[PDB]
């Protein structure tokens, strides 16, 4: 099920209007409280006009509006489900202004909901874009309108959150299609649900945010429901899902074709697991011991150019297992991992000890020692999230999470740990004074301009449970050293919730749920605008553009010459992301040195050290002096 964020508005003074209505299934039979009834536009004799449709609401006072639910019918009629939708809000019935909410209904009879932030309005416009079977009709046995018990408005400076993004499913895996720009997302077997999948089967769903549209797609091809994945953008350009329901499969997407393509099987049967693109463009995985057994799972090697899995037992998982009350159900997942120097990846947690992961030969380990500071060795941090904000300097930002995978309270914690050459012990200390929440099941992403967009989570976790939630999101800002909050947001994002870095440089928060019955499915995203984004007057500032490229694939230690409309200040590469279970291996950012050509055309070289420009895509970000960034050019890393 889903729930809606507010209280139910009573419907005695209401005025509705509709595009049309066939009589017994009147405009008002949406409101009149009654399941058995509903609205219906004209059919057979009166014709068939086809979506969008409208039902606009007067609620003749001005609310402090947070949501909506549209049950459709329930006669056992699928004709007139919604499903593209749009909802609008006005104070006078004729400015609307842009949707506070917009995307697809899933084709069943369930109660819908589009939850927003706050926004006082005396009037409300549902449009129905689209029939979910692609019929002309729409239809609307009830529909609510929610309420806030208060309105605050955001405050300048910090952010903004909105519109909502409406799904057909609960997005808890994502990522990035670099080819074309759309968020890509995954359920399991249901668009709500992964308990007792059958397998093989996996409901996706995207986002283009250039058209907006929102379109779904069983994928049945590579025979696998990839819920639970390691999930890694390979040194080709291809997102690597292993595991998770089907625990020894391996499936590739393509977002050139655009198409799912099997995979060699792995190894070792995992779920949980983290996987990372090495500095040569293949694919290092270990642990995993949620699926396909609970056992002492070690490294294996996929190679993209061979197609082969390649088991590399010395690369022992022992070293870094957490101290988790469950035991290795647990211990070994969600390792924090990143590709680095000659094909080593670097394990920063969640145990307290880190470690080295070589990949020649049948692997090995090494210890790096363990998270630590002035304050004392950082404990377990199941589920904390670690962000490679600067690849150049080796620098990454570690944060929040539990000692156990739930029913454990989530910590402050956090640390810088620099890295160095591979087999070293690198430096960690105290992120200033910590995170001002306590969070556990939150997301990250590196933004533009270097600083970490630390959003969502629970004080105590308690996956499927809604308690006790942090609405306010933090940004850590590296040359600072400080923590500074944002405009909080009013969805809860605890366990199965998402990050990833749009290429306009705008964050897509959504999901947490997927636990079919309960009420805590949460069917959409949230648009975060960072303040970089607005300018002095809390209107949008101007971006500068990139004119052109003097190329779009590029060599490590390759260069590229770039001409701007306007003079910039900085420069980055950000590599595209992949998210599920707090687990994000693709995202990392280069800091640009920019040589000036003069007429505003500059040029930087890419990094010679494929373990910080590791293979794939990138998205090209310029700042101006005011330190707002252009939308991302996309560049092909090769090695
Ligand atoms: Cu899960
Ligand atoms: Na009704």
Redesign the pocket.
């Known amino acids: 099920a889903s729930a809606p964020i507010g209280s139910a508005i009573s419907r005695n003074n209401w005025a509705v209007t509709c595009d049309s209505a066939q009589s017994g299934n009147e405009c008002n039979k949406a409101i009149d409280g009654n399941k058995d009834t509903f609205w219906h536009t004209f059919y057979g004799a009166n014709g068939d006009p086809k979506p969008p449709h409208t039902y606009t609401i007067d609620m003749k006072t001005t609310q402090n509006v947070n949501g909506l639910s549209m049950l459709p019918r329930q006669d056992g009629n699928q004709n007139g489900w919604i499903g593209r939708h749009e909802v609008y809000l006005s104070s006078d019935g004729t400015n609307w202004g842009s949707p506070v909410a917009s995307g697809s209904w899933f084709a069943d009879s369930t109660t819908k909901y589009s939850n927003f932030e706050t926004r006082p309005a005396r009037y409300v416009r549902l449009v129905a874009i689209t029939e979910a079977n692609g019929q002309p009709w729409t239809s609307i046995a009830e529909i609510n309108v929610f309420q806030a018990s208060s309105y605050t408005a955001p405050q300048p400076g910090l952010g903004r959150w909105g519109p909502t993004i409406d799904l057909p499913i609960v997005p ?1 895996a994502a990522a990035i299609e670099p080819t074309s720009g759309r968020v890509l997302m995954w359920s399991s077997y249901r668009n709500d649900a ?1 308990g007792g999948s059958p397998g093989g089967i996996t409901l996706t769903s995207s986002w283009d945010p250039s058209t907006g549209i929102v379109s779904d797609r069983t994928v049945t091809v590579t025979k696998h429901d990839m ?2 994945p390691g999930i890694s953008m390979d040194g080709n350009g291809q997102i690597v899902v292993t595991g998770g329901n089907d625990a020894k499969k391996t499936s590739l997407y393509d977002s050139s074709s655009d198409s799912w393509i099997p995979g060699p099987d792995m190894q070792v049967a995992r779920g ?1 697991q983290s996987s990372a693109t090495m500095s040569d463009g293949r694919v290092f995985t270990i642990g995993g011991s ?1 699926s396909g057994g609970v056992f002492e799972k070690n490294g294996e090697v996929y190679s993209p150019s061979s197609k082969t899995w390649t088991s590399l037992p010395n690369a022992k998982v022992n070293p870094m297992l957490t101290a988790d009350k469950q035991g290795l159900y647990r211990s070994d997942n969600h390792a924090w991992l990143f590709g680095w120097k000659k094909g080593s990846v670097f394990q920063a947690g969640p145990s307290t000890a880190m470690n080295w992961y070589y990949t020649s030969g049948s692997g090995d380990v090494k210890s790096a020692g363990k998270r630590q500071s002035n304050r004392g060795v950082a404990p377990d941090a199941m589920c904390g999230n670690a962000v490679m904000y600067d690849a150049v300097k080796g620098k990454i930002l570690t944060f929040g999470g539990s000692p156990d995978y739930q029913d454990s309270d989530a910590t402050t914690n956090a640390h810088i740990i620099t890295l160095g050459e591979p087999g070293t012990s690198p430096n960690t200390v105290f992120a200033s004074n910590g995170l001002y929440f306590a969070r556990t099941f939150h997301t990250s992403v590196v933004l533009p301009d270097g600083s970490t967009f630390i959003t969502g989570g629970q004080r105590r976790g308690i ?1 499927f449970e809604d308690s006790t939630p942090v609405f306010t999101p933090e940004i850590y800002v590296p040359e600072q050293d400080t923590f500074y909050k944002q405009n909080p947001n009013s969805i809860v994002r605890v ?2 919730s998402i990050s990833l870095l749009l290429p306009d440089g705008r964050v897509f928060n959504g999901g947490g749920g ?1 636990c079919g019955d309960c009420t805590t499915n949460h069917f959409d995203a949230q648009i975060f605008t960072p303040n970089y984004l607005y300018n002095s007057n809390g209107n949008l500032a101007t971006r500068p553009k990139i004119t052109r490229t003097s190329t779009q694939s590029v060599k490590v230690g390759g260069r590229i010459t770039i001409s701007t409309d306007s003079s910039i200040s900085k420069a980055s590469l950000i590599r595209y992301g992949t998210a599920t ?1 707090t687990v994000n291996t693709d995202q990392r950012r280069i800091p640009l040195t920019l040589t000036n050509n003069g007429g505003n055309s500059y040029s930087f070289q890419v990094p010679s050290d494929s373990g910080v420009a590791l293979p794939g895509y990138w998205m090209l970000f310029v700042m101006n002096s005011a330190g707002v960034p252009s939308v991302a050019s996309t560049i092909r890393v090769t090695q």
């Open positions: 808890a992964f819920f639970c949980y949620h996956p366990y199965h997927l279970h």
